[PDB]
Structures are given as C-alpha cells and as structure tokens.
C-alpha cells in the first residue's frame, strides 16, 4: 500500500508515495539465487549504432533481470512448489520463485492472490482451477480472469504481462480457435485456443496509486525530462519559439514528425491479425 513519509526537507513539499513492500513481500535487500540471473543493459532510446530512436530515455539504474520461463513447455506435468515472491525491477510486475517436485527451480509471473508454499501445474491437460494454472483455453469455462497470453502457439506469454492486467472471457469460436477475449486496452481479440496463458489477474493493481513525487525519482526509473512541443525552436519542431507564449498552430498539431497524435488511426487492416478483431474501441471490427 502507498504511504507518505515526513521528510522534513527545507526545499518545498513532496507528494511522493512508496509501497510498504513488506506486508506483501520479504527480503528488502538483494539476496538472489545464482545461475538464474542475467544482467541487463539499458539503451536510453539509442539504436544498435548509438543513434536516437526513442525520446527522453535515460538515467535508469542498473537492474539484473531474473530468468523467467514464459513458454513454460520445457518441462510439464511436474508440480511446482511456490517458494518466494521476488520484486522484479525490470517490470511493473513481480517474479515468483517456484521449486519443481523433481529437484529444479524456476521463475514465473506473480498474479494477485497467491501465497508462498502453494502448488501449481502447467500442462496441456485440464488441471485444478487455481490462479496460476495454465491449460488449453478450450478447457477453461467462461467468467474467469486470465493474463500472460501468447500470440504464437508455444511462443511464450507476451500479451498482458504488466501489473494489474487481466482479460475478460467472451466465449469461444466454433473452429476450435479464436477464443474471444476483452483486453485491458479497449480492444476485443480472437486468440488461438492452442495458445496458453496463466489465469488470474496480475499482482500490484495499486500501481495506479504510487506517486513519483519529484523529477529525481522519475529520472532514476529511466524517463528523462523532455521539452514541450511549443517551446521547441521553429526549426526543430515548428510549434513555437521566440519571446512570448503563442497559441498552438494548425489544427491537429504534429509530433516531432508530420504525423497526427490525437485522432489518427495508426493501425492498418492489411495483416492476418485483422480477422482476429471483434471490437476496435472506435466502433466495431
């Protein structure tokens, strides 16, 4: 839960909030387990040659990525024992260290409502209905919450893997695939029942409550201060410049490039994923 701390600072006030991190987790100091960690580097919006591709990225602190299993099909039908819920500095979600019943450990996603010591299973057969279990979508009745859904069959959970993410079950299609799901984006997609996912909502739904409070906390995440479009030079980004603030220019102002950013439909219907759409959050299909 978010909370504030009286810092007694002599430089203004702050509305920053921090989560207690200990009525839900443990071990506030880095004490990980070896052979399951990969050091990750940040790019700061730069390309493979060092040229800018993304804006205002930088200042992030070093983070060691935890080796998570996303495909989860490497070893199935072996029951795992939940051993810990570890903070993941690489993502808004948290990782979970589980121990298999054969003598191995792994990292998985942490949904909300799980406990340390529980037992889970990832198989291609129907299994116990607990948040975390994964099975073919044809075996799951409607009315549940699912996350970490893959688009590639046996590809690995990519869609809906941030904190406080879920999907609403909207029935199944005749063809044995194209299960209808309402996603947390305003869209509604027909996925593949061959593709699997981890049921349950992702933990940390309170991510909408945390407050950065100051520019410093934001910079250390990896978000750099950036200038507004109006304050840009008449040549770098021609929405202003010179003495005195001026009203914005032509209708539907531009990005650093000539594109619109308020009402332009930037998705095209010339892909196979177009047939996978039911609701497009701007009408139908």
């Amino acid at each position: 839960p978010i909370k504030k701390i009286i810092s007694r600072s002599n430089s203004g006030i702050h509305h920053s909030t921090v989560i207690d991190y200990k009525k839900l987790l443990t071990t506030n100091k880095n004490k990980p387990e070896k052979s399951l960690l990969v050091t990750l580097k940040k790019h700061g919006g730069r390309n493979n040659q060092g040229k800018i591709t993304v804006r205002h990225q930088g200042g992030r602190n070093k983070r060691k990525y935890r080796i998570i299993d996303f495909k989860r099909t490497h070893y199935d039908n072996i029951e795992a024992t939940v051993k810990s819920i570890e903070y993941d500095p690489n993502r808004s979600c948290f990782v979970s260290l589980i121990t298999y019943a054969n003598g191995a450990k792994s990292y998985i996603i942490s949904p909300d409502g799980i406990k340390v010591g529980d037992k889970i299973l990832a198989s291609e057969h129907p299994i116990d209905i607990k948040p975390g279990f994964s099975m073919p979508l044809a075996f799951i009745p409607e009315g549940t919450q699912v996350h970490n859904i893959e688009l590639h069959p046996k590809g690995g959970g990519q869609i809906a893997r941030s904190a406080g993410s879920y999907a609403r079950i909207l029935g199944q299609d005749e063809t044995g695939k194209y299960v209808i799901l309402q996603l947390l984006s305003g869209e509604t997609r027909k996925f593949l029942k061959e593709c699997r996912a981890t049921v349950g909502v992702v933990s940390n739904l309170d991510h909408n409550l945390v407050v950065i409070g100051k520019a410093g906390r934001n910079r250390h995440r990896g978000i750099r201060p950036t200038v507004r479009g109006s304050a840009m030079n008449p040549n770098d980004h021609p929405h202003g410049g010179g003495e005195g603030r001026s009203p914005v220019g032509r209708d539907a102002p531009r990005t650093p490039w000539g594109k619109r950013h308020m009402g332009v439909k930037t998705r095209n219907m010339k892909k196979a994923s177009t047939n996978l759409i039911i609701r497009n959050r701007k009408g139908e299909q």
């Binding site: 199935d76 039908n77 198989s123 291609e124 057969h125």
Partner: protein, 145 residues
C-alpha cells in the same frame, strides 16, 4: 507453361493424355505428379516415343505400386510417445516416418501421404490413398510410455 499431363487423370473427366488446362502453372509445377518433356522436341518426332514412354510409365507405376503395397505389409512401423500415463503429452507427425524411411534408404514423399499431424498409440492399422490405382495399407505399433 507446360501443356503435357502426367501420372494420372487430373481429377476431372478426361483421358490420361497430353491435354491440360491453359495455365502451365495450374498444378503442373506445384505437383511432383505433373511431369512433361520439352515441347520443342515434342512437335512430331516425339509423338510415338512419348506414347510408348507413357505406356511403359503406366506399367511400371502399376508394378511398383503393387510392390510397395507388398513391402509396407512387412515394414510395419514402430514408434513411441512420452505421455502422462496415456494422457496427451507427445506429438505424432509424418516427420518420424520420413526419418525412418530416410535411414532405410528408400524415399517417401509428401504426395505418398495426405495427413499433417496424427495421434494414437497401441497397435493400429491405417489405410492411406496414393492414387486411383492403389491404396497403401500399413500397421503401426506406438508405445505410450
């Protein structure tokens, strides 16, 4: 564009002969069962030569189809599937059959089968069509480990 039919009557009312659909790429170059000879030589000198070649090809096709039907009756396949006490945990495809045929030294192509992925264990008998001429019948023993 090729204008010579080969290996069969092309799925519609016709005689197994030269005449073809006016595409040259209808199924010709996409089917290994559609062969031909250069039309430059097939103006008038190759008429009887290709007639006798077609007759000889028909005869050997019948003979080798029967010989392969007899051979598959003694080369019964044997495979395994790692499963959760019979619960589906493995995949059965034509690929392992292709690999064992490879190791045997003989060739089995895509057109000798009509499946994509299969399933099943125990000892079971299958019957797959090859042409209107013959139809392959085989037996396979899959162990559900």
């Amino acid at each position: 564009m090729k204008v010579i039919l080969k290996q069969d009557v092309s799925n519609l009312g016709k005689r197994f002969d030269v005449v073809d659909v006016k595409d040259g790429y209808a199924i010709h170059f996409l089917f290994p069962k559609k062969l031909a000879a250069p039309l430059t030589k097939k103006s008038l000198q190759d008429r009887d030569l290709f007639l006798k070649k077609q007759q000889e090809h028909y005869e050997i096709n019948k003979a080798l189809s029967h010989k392969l039907k007899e051979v598959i009756e003694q080369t019964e396949l044997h495979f395994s599937l790692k499963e959760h006490n019979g619960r589906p945990y493995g995949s059965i495809i034509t690929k392992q059959i292709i690999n064992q045929a490879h190791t045997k030294g003989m060739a089995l192509q895509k057109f000798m089968f009509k499946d994509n992925v299969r399933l099943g264990f125990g000892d079971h008998e299958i019957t797959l069509h090859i042409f209107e001429d013959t139809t392959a019948v085989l037996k396979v023993k899959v162990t559900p480990d």
